[PDB]
């Protein structure tokens, strides 16, 4: 009996404010193509529409707030597929794979355009590296962002 909090709507809301580099606040083909293209890709057009229907429950061409949570909430049973999170992992690591470095992430953290650098990230990797070996491993990663 605490779902009346605001930490939730605040978390997802932050994702958009960062993703929707425009203002609408919805993941669309133009918003996806832009960001996605900034990573290093360039799929066709018809391929995008297919990427929309396969996830656009309603059909407004773009998913908003209810649709977003509905896609992350409406979990059709379970397939035990951890490939998703995995990919996100291989992404952060542009070079070697198994640990995160300051310089490595810095580049993957600058691609965006917020207000981070080496010092700030340092506080993020340091606090994240509970052990303190020097870099972030998979444990501290699957132990800090673990599915409560």
């Amino acid at each position: 009996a605490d779902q009346l909090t605001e930490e939730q709507i605040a978390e997802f809301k932050e994702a958009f404010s960062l993703f929707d580099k425009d203002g609408d606040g919805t993941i669309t083909t133009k918003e996806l193509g832009t960001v996605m293209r900034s990573l290093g890709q360039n799929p066709t057009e018809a391929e995008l529409q297919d990427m929309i229907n396969e996830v656009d429950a309603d059909g407004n061409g773009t998913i908003d707030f209810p649709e977003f949570l509905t896609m992350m909430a409406r979990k059709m049973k379970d397939t035990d597929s951890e490939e998703e999170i995995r990919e996100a992992f291989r992404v952060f690591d542009k070079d070697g794979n198994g640990f995160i470095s300051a310089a490595e992430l810095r580049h993957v953290m600058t691609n965006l355009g917020e207000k981070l650098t080496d010092e700030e990230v340092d506080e993020m990797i340091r606090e994240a590296d509970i052990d303190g070996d020097g870099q972030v491993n998979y444990e501290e990663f699957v132990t800090m962002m673990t599915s409560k």
Partner: peptide, 26 residues
Amino acid sequence: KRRWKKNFIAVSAANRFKKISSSGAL
């Protein structure tokens, strides 16, 4: 307030969208 959350989640939105493609054989 300061974590790799909003960061990982964001990429997850664009990554999942891509994975939604197919990723399957027969």
